[PDB]
Each structure stands twice: as C-alpha cells, then as structure tokens.
Amino acid sequence: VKNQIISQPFPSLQLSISLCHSSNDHLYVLEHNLHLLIREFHKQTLSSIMMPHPASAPFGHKRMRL
Amino acid sequence: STLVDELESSFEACFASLVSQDQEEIRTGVDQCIQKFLDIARQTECFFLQKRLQLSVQKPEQVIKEDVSELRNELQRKDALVQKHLTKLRHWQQVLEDI
Amino acid sequence: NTASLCRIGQETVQDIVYRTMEIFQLLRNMQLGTYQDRLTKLQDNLRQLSVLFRKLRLVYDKCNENDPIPVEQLIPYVESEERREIAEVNKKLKQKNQQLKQIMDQLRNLIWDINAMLAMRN
Amino acid sequence: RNQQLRTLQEECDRKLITLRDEISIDLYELEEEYYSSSS
Numbered sequence: 001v002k003n004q005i006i007s008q009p010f011p012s013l014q015l016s017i018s019l020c021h022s023s024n025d026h027l028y029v030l031e032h033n034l035h036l037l038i039r040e041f042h043k044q045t046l047s048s049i050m051m052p053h054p055a056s057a058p059f060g061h062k063r064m065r066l
Numbered sequence: 067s068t069l070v071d072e073l074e075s076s077f078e079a080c081f082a083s084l085v086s087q088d089q090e091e092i093r094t095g096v097d098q099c100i101q102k103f104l105d106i107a108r109q110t111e112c113f114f115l116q117k118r119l120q121l122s123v124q125k126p127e128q129v130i131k132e133d134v135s136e137l138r139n140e141l142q143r144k145d146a147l148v149q150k151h152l153t154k155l156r157h158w159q160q161v162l163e164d165i
Numbered sequence: 166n167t168a169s170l171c172r173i174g175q176e177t178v179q180d181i182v183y184r185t186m187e188i189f190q191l192l193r194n195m196q197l198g199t200y201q202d203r204l205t206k207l208q209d210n211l212r213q214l215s216v217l218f219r220k221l222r223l224v225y226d227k228c229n230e231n232d233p234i235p236v237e238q239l240i241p242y243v244e245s246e247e248r249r250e251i252a253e254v255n256k257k258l259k260q261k262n263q264q265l266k267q268i269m270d271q272l273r274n275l276i277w278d279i280n281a282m283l284a285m286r287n
Numbered sequence: 288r289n290q291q292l293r294t295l296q297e298e299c300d301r302k303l304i305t306l307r308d309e310i311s312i313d314l315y316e317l318e319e320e321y322y323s324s325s326s
Binding site: 068069070073074077080103104107110111114115116117118119120121122123124125127128129130131132133134137138140141144148151 | 175181218225229233234247
C-alpha cells in the first residue's frame, strides 16, 4: 500500500511486513534473517568466487567455469 | 510347593552343567533349563497379580494411598528438575551478560 | 501397603531374570587386572541376586499372610477424605504441568530461533 | 578493525552455540518429565 506488504501464505494466515520509520507479536527472527539475506545478496556481487586464479582466465563465478 | 522354592531350584538347575567335576548336549540342557526358569517366573508374576487384583477389589484404600504417594513423588521430582534448570539459566544469564 | 507389596514382589521377579541375563553376559565375555575386575563384578552380581531371592521370599510370606473371593468373579461382564486428597494433588500437579508446558514451549522457541538465526549467517 | 570485529563475532557465536546445547539437554529432561506425567 505505502509502507506495508500484506501476504496470505496459508488461507487462515496473514503475514505483514511494514517499514516503521519513526522520524523523530513481532517476530525478530524474520527481521534478522531479512538483514542477513540482503547482506548475502550484496556479498554475492563482491565475492572472491568471481576471481579467476589462472591469470589468463577471464572472470565470473567458479562453478560456472567448472 | 511354594513357587519361590521351585524358582530357586530351577535357577540352580540352570547352572548344573557348569558347576561339576559337546554342543547339542549343552543346547538341549540350556533350552530346557531356561524354559522351566521362565515358566516359573511367569507363574510367580501371575500369583502377585492375582493377589493385587483381590486386594484392589476388596481393600481399595491401599490403591488410593499408593496413588497419593506416586503423585507426591511426581511433584517433588518436577520441582527438583525446575530448580536445576533455573540455576543453569541464571548461570547462563551471567555468562551472556559479559559480552 | 500390601497392594504395593504385590508390586514390589512383581518387580523382584522382573529383576531376577534380568540379573541372570547380565550374569550370563558376564560369563560370555570372560576371556580366561581386568580378569580380577570381572571376578569382582561376577561375585557382586551373585551377592545382589541372593539378596533378591531372600527379599522375594520375604515379600511372598508377607503377601501370602494377608482369600474369600475367588477370581473370575471379579471381572465385570455386561449383563472418603482420601478421594479429596487425590483431588487436591490432582489439581496441584495440573497447575504444575501447565507451568511446565509454558517453560518447555519457551525453551523450544528459543532453540528454534537460535538455530534459524545461526543458520542464516553463512 | 576487520580483525577485531571478526573476533567479537566469533566469541558471540561460540557463546550462543554452547547456550543452545545446554538448553537442549535441559529441554530433553523437561520433555521426558512432562510427557511422562500421569496427571
């Protein structure tokens, strides 16, 4: 809607994710995992897996080379 | 007579091949001794259960007394468990406070 | 009293058979200092078993002292302050069990949260 | 700065893992007691 996402994963269930901006029932686990998920999503770009140890080898992920 | 004494005699009969001064002799002797031993054990358990049944139909206050005792031991055991757990929780709060 | 003596007498017969089984296992493993340790274990087991036999004869005599109703008259076919004591202790450990359930649920939830949060850090 | 923060993170995670194991053993005892209660 504006700052609130509402989902219905199970039919009797309603999940709500809201960004509370103070501008001066809550589950902590999902908030903490949200921070870690976006942190892993950042670190995927800046990973050392993109580095090619063979100097001639161009670039990109390691298993995609394999 | 007196099933205790038959149990004692059969139990001593289980060892009779060892304590004195090949395979199939040992096998048949062991099977017969162990089967008579377990049979008299089951008859002794049957006697104790029949006597408990007659007591539970004639004198039912004793059963209620034993239930009272068992529920009281359950209470004391629950409190002992929660006290040990609470001491461990307070120790872990003192550990986690120091980071 | 006597209707717990019957329970103890059943438990003695249940212990005698288990103890003879443990004795036969000890005699199975004995390979001709640990020699002497197995000797001590064997002699101690045999001592406890003789104690169990004496206790069993005691319990037999006590229950056989203390029947006017024959069995098979006792089965139902188709066609007072101690009760209040029972109700008291029942209500007591009802409350104790519900509090124990709350403690157990909070421990479960803390364990699940710890494992989820630590699983996502990698 | 990176090495100091990594050491602090590792200390926190070791504390949490040991806490989880001790709490799990206590939970096992409490589960046995609660489920095997006569009531």
